[PDB]
Amino acid sequence: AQICDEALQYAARLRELEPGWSATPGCQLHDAEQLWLDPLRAQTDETFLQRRLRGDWPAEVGNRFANWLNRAVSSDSQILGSPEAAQWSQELSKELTMFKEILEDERD
Amino acid sequence: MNAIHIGPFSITPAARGLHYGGLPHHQWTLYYGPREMAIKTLPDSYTSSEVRDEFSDIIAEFVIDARHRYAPDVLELVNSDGDAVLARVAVSRLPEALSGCIPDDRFPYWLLTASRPRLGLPVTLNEYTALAVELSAPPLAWITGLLPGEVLTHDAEEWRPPTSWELRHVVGEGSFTGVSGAAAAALLGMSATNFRKYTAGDSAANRQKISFAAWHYLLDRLGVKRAS
């Protein structure tokens, strides 16, 4: 539960930067998560990107973050073979549940 | 001030001085023999036991690296599957008959290496204990990586007596074993005054060399070699 706060605290300090930092040209800029990384780009683009956050309601960034944290767990076959990875997946499912819950009602 | 000698390490000061800020200052240089590890500018108000504490962390990191990179090879005793490690022993040298092996069911006990291309040998418990007795590694066997191979050899014709600096690796207050000269002399059954002649440096009057039997028995008693 402490991981998603500092993840949100990370997105807190991206809100203080330039409104259109992610709108610059670039070959690789992680546009899949750009709907949540830059909330202030909706003010610059009234219809080009404001409705993109409204229409899509990005919640798969948490799925991308879930794949990242899967690299942060110990790669032990004993945990996967036994039920140790079961409740670890149960706590992974629930902790990403209210984490993703914040992102959909960000437009309010 | 004075050059602080901590076992094989020697913190020598700069002959000239400097005034960083307004206070007097000197450059203290840590040495591992002919190897220079650090220069640290320190005041003249510090005592020797405080410059020693200032340079202690680099020495501790050096000792950690030396213990890790010269750790003896570990052998593993496993069942007829190779998944469960029943017993592990650190060895100074591998068994003579090791070949690339994957455990099977026809033998109950297998002696595999800890390296991922696991060499192995089918053994029983009695032969495993014979190999463990013959091949075991002493607790301070990592100090042999910091010593030349011609001072650790058991062949008397190819053996060279260790120098004073190579002797400071295993005996002394700031040595890698931590035993004093009096304790080392008591382990060799000789007087401390004669061992101080072994550990004497730069004093050409009355400086002696250790013998083959004394050196190897000392390495036996300190836990560095020949303690299988």
């Binding site: 690789q28 992680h30 546009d31 899949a32 709907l35 993109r52 229409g55 899509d56 | 190779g82 070949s99 690339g100 092996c101 994957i102 099977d104 026809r106 033998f107 991922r116 291309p117 696991r118 060499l119 192995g120 040998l121 089918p122």
Partner: protein, 335 residues
């Protein structure tokens, strides 16, 4: 005491090239050398939400909102020209030999024992029955995986190159040769004995395999699929990309060799579904259910270890399968 090596890597035998794709008309196949290559094109698509929901998305308030903004994708496709109805593929296949010799080994006594084990097999049973089923997989266009599932007529041409010029030409018809029956034929035995010549190391074998399939006027062909890094936008996701070597849709070489390996029939489960590829633990990616389980001790490793270490020779019928995996090679031998 002899034991298996820690590393037992084998090189791959019967290595095929990358099968190109060119399009043309039927009965023009005798002059299909300069046929135009199949080029991958681009289509922008959208799709309604059709995947199975998780019982929490089934509310009509948000299910109707799901189809308000359906996902947009940009898919790569491979289609024939309008004035073309025949798909032509071409690749070369070599037969190397030396199945029992590993590229890398650890135990010298185990390597010698494995060589003696495969030496007794060759004299007792030559590289013939495996070579026959390798000829059938060359005969029918199984390497056209889904490019022949509804094809009216498929013809396969197999040539033999010695000094840059064709020596013996083999022509088969794939519709007559089923994917489930491994029969006997005089033309296939001529091909099979050539495979046996390469497998035994007698001589060099280089086969140019050209297959023609009748699909339709301007339909879609199905080449190998690549991977997408997915770093773009959510509208131009580029969810599909097809294999192409030089502006020409093609098939992976391991895709061709996968179908050429589909000779394993003898797995202890029921064989009504058909043959499978010779692999350790007898697995195909289509069903996700592996035959030859280690619990039933009919896998590669249990059969290989018993036949070499314990000298437990199995029947003649499964030892065709342990050598077959030595043909494809592998990285056999764990820590």
């Amino acid at each position: 005491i002899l034991s298996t090596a820690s590393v037992l890597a084998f090189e791959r035998k019967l290595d095929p090239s990358d099968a190109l794709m060119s399009a043309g008309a039927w009965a023009q196949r005798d002059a299909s050398q300069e046929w135009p290559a199949v080029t991958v094109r681009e289509k922008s698509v959208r799709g309604t939400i059709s995947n199975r929901l998780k019982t929490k998305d089934r509310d009509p308030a948000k299910l109707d909102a799901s189809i308000q903004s359906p996902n947009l994708q940009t898919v790569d496709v491979a289609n024939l020209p309008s004035d073309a109805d025949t798909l032509k593929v071409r690749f070369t296949l070599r037969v190397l030999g030396g199945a029992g010799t590993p590229s890398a080994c650890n135990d010298a006594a185990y390597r010698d024992k494995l060589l003696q084990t495969v030496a007794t097999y060759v004299n007792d049973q030559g590289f013939a029955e495996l070579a026959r089923r390798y000829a059938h997989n060359l005969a029918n266009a199984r390497f056209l995986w889904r490019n022949r599932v509804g094809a009216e007529a498929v013809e396969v041409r197999i040539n033999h190159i010695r000094q840059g010029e064709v020596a013996r030409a083999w022509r088969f018809d794939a519709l007559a040769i089923g994917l489930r029956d491994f029969k006997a034929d005089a033309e296939l035995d001529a091909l099979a004995e050539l495979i046996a010549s390469g497998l035994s190391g007698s001589g060099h074998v280089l086969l140019e395999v050209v297959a023609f399939a009748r699909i339709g006027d301007g339909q879609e062909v199905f080449p190998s699929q690549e991977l997408i890094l997915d770093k773009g936008d959510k509208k131009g996701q580029k969810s599909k990309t097809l294999y192409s070597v030089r502006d020409a849709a093609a098939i992976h070489s391991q895709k061709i060799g996968n179908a050429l390996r589909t000779i394993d029939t003898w797995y202890p489960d029921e064989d009504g579904l058909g043959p499978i590829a010779v692999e350790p633990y007898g697995s195909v990616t289509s069903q996700g259910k592996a035959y030859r389980q280690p619990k039933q001790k009919l896998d590669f490793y249990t059969l290989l270890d018993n036949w070499v270490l314990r000298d437990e020779a199995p029947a003649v019928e499964q030892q065709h399968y342990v050598i077959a995996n030595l043909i494809r090679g592998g990285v056999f031998g764990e820590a």
